[PDB]
Amino acid sequence: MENFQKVEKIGEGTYGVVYKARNKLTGEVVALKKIPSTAIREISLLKELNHPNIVKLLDVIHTKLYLVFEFLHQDLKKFMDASALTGIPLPLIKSYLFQLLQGLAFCHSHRVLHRDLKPQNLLINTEGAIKLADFGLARAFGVPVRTYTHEVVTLWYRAPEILLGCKYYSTAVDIWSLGCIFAEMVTRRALFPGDSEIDQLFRIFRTLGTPDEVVWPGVTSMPDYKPSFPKWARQDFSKVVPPLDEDGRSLLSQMLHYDPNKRISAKAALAHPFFQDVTKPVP
Numbered sequence: 001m002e003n004f005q006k007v008e009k010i011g012e013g014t015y016g017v018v019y020k021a022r023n024k025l026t027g028e029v030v031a032l033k034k035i036p037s038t039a040i041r042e043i044s045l046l047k048e049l050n051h052p053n054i055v056k057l058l059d060v061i062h063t064k065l066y067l068v069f070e071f072l073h074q075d076l077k078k079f080m081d082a083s084a085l086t087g088i089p090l091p092l093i094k095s096y097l098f099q100l101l102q103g104l105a106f107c108h109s110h111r112v113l114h115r116d117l118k119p120q121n122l123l124i125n126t127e128g129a130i131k132l133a134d135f136g137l138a139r140a141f142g143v144p145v146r147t148y149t150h151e152v153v154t155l156w157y158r159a160p161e162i163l164l165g166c167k168y169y170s171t172a173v174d175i176w177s178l179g180c181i182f183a184e185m186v187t188r189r190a191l192f193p194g195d196s197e198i199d200q201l202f203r204i205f206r207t208l209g210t211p212d213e214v215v216w217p218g219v220t221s222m223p224d225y226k227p228s229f230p231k232w233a234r235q236d237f238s239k240v241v242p243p244l245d246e247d248g249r250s251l252l253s254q255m256l257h258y259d260p261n262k263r264i265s266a267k268a269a270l271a272h273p274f275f276q277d278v279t280k281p282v283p
């Protein structure tokens with residue numbers, strides 16, 4: 001840590017504070033996150049899983065646990081807010097989704113889940129790239145109810161199988177989260193802004209329909225499923241994400257499939273016709 005000069009605090013992660021910092025030797029500017037050997041082993045393995053749309057883990061220092069990350073200047077949440085009045089142009093939305101799916105496809109091919117995808121851990125630069133931060137840390141530390149600052153961890157992007165009590169969920173949970181984020185960029189409003197687990201579930205239910213054995217085999221048997229769940233009817237995506245075109249609505253509906261086994265994969269999504277005219281605009 002004596003190798004680093006903290007430049008400024010740039011935020012608070014789930015697990016610890018994040019600083020902008022400079023390497024005193026190399027002058028390299030990095031992001032420094034300050035936070036059990038099983039966790040150390042898991043994180044170490046993540047150091048080799050490099051991809052251009054994954055925020056690079058440069059180093060792990062343990063003496064307290066410090067993670068040294070590639071630095072980017074802005075997060076997507078701030079950009080979405082800054083864009084709220086005009087909306088992010090479709091071509092940039094399309095480019096960001098395309099890149100995020102490439103990041104998911106890579107990590108998932110290695111059987112690593114993110115588990116807590118949200119706008120606040122997607123980072124962007126002036127060159128039009130977008131990258132996922134905190135990938136893999138959920139398996140290392142778990143996903144708390146509150147952050148280290150007691151802030152409520154958002155439920156808005158949490159897949160329904162997690163909410164319904166499944167212990168062994170899949171890479172599909174990340175596709176769900178990304179679909180929620182996709183819808184949010186398009187409409188400029190959170191798709192399912194739940195303020196508790198049950199409110200989160202019911203918001204999902206009110207839009208996509210209360211799931212049954214027809215749409216989701218095995219659902220009524222899950223740990224936290226209750227037969228007393230109100231039965232809401234499914235709404236049209238035309239009503240959910242106007243004015244997204246039918247290619248976009250088709251892809252989104254597949255990313256939000258209830259059955260995790262049927263939910264579209266990152267690799268399959270990259271081949272969806274929605275990305276036929278994908279380009280790489282700069283923000």
Ligand SMILES: Cc1nnc2nc3ccc([N+](=O)[O-])cc3c(-c3ccccc3Cl)nc1-2
Binds near residue numbers: 010012070072120122
């Ligand atoms: C890793 C990593 N590398 N560069 C980073 N740059 C940032 C620039 C702006 C903002 N911000 O909030 O304005 C946050 C970050 C974060 C970050 C901080 C707290 C919680 C989560 C995240 Cl992702 N992390 C970065």
